[PDB]
Amino acid sequence: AVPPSLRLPVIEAAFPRQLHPYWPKLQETTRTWLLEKRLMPADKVEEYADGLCYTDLMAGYYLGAPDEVLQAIADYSAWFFVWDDRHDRDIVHGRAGAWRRLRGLLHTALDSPGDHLHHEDTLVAGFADSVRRLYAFLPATWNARFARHFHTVIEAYDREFHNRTRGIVPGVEEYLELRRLTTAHWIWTDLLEPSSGCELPDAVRKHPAYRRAALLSQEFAAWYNDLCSLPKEIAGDEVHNLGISLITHHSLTLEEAIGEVRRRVEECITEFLAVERDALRFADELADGTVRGKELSGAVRANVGNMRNWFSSVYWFHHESGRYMVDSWDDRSTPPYVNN
Ligand SMILES: CC[N+](CC)(CC)Cc1ccccc1
Ligand SMILES: [Mg+2]
Ligand SMILES: [Mg+2]
Ligand SMILES: [Mg+2]
């Protein structure tokens, strides 16, 4: 039963959940990978990993992905959650040097992941393993685009480190721009392509309806995370959340801010529904009778279908995952699954 303040009847009625058939194997394989890569302690893996639902989140999103693609994506996504936790802990403990060094190593590993498979920092080694595997599916031009996007993501995390150390809450537009990077909008969008087996040409993926559908799917993910993760984040002195920007700068109350975030989330859904029609029309137009046209049409259609699936996967993940269950923790500021 979703809390009333978080419930979205449109998602529940009109965005039916999907689950990839590889999910049962995926859950165990990513748990084993977190253990083998030492990304979490063994006892915390055993107690918490399945309950975190990270594999479920990806298996509800990249429908149709080959199993090996989904495995690499799921391992990368679990890594990404552990990195968010590492970042948080470095901020809380004032580890500016450790963060700066990790930031530099991730930029280097992202360009040369094979070189870093056995790095002393298991967080760097786990990143490099997942990225090397993601770089094995499509041409180097796709890999270069993934890297360009993730270099930008690393720098947004650096900006968050400085905001939280200086106590700066970004303004609303500043925040919204930053949040397209800390959510990694363009990484998840890039990953649609190995999932459907096709690197899309710039003229296809930059088509206005493809771009706007992709944007709105990720804005939903970001802002619905903000709505659901607000309690854990207030408890943990996190400053990055649309609700916090609204409270801090527009003098809204917590109740007013939650309402405004919810309204922005709801409008994202119905803006998506409008553009989804145009993006599927474009998929139709690509099927011009040629072999290449059929390939591009089917890839666009699968990708736009997964942009839709992200809404239901994100919605349910926030109510199933132990990541956000702050009421269940003895110390609300220290989630039991992080390394403190
Ligand atoms: C792994 C995803 N992420 C940011 C990229 C890491 C903390 C948080 C997130 C979870 C769910 C929806 C949106 C963002
Ligand atoms: Mg976080
Ligand atoms: Mg974060
Ligand atoms: Mg959050």
From Swiss-Prot:
Co-factor remark: Binds 3 Mg(2+) ions per subunit. Can also use Mn(2+) and Fe(3+) but less efficiently, and other divalent cations such as Zn(2+), Fe(2+), Co(2+), Cu(2+) and Ni(2+) are nearly completely inefficient as cofactors.
Binding positions (Mg(2+) 2): 84, 88
Key words, A-Z: Lyase, Magnesium, Metal-binding
Pfam families: Terpene_syn_C_2
Cofactor: Mg(2+); Mn(2+); Fe(3+)
Motif (DDXXD motif): 84-88
Catalysis performed (reactions): (2E,6E)-farnesyl diphosphate = (+)-epi-isozizaene + diphosphate
Chain residues that bind Mg(2+) 1: 84, 88
Gene Ontology molecular functions: epi-isozizaene synthase activity; metal ion binding; terpene synthase activity
SUPFAM superfamilies: Terpenoid synthases
UniProt key word Metal-binding: yes
Record CDD domains: Terpene_cyclase_nonplant_C1
PANTHER family: BETA-PINACENE SYNTHASE-RELATED (PTHR35201:SF4), TERPENE SYNTHASE (PTHR35201)
Domain remark text: The Asp-Asp-Xaa-Xaa-Asp/Glu (DDXXD/E) motif is important for the catalytic activity, presumably through binding to Mg(2+).
Family: Belongs to the terpene synthase family.
Protein name: Epi-isozizaene synthase
Organism encoding this protein: Streptomyces coelicolor (strain ATCC BAA-471 / A3(2) / M145)
Gene name of the record: cyc1
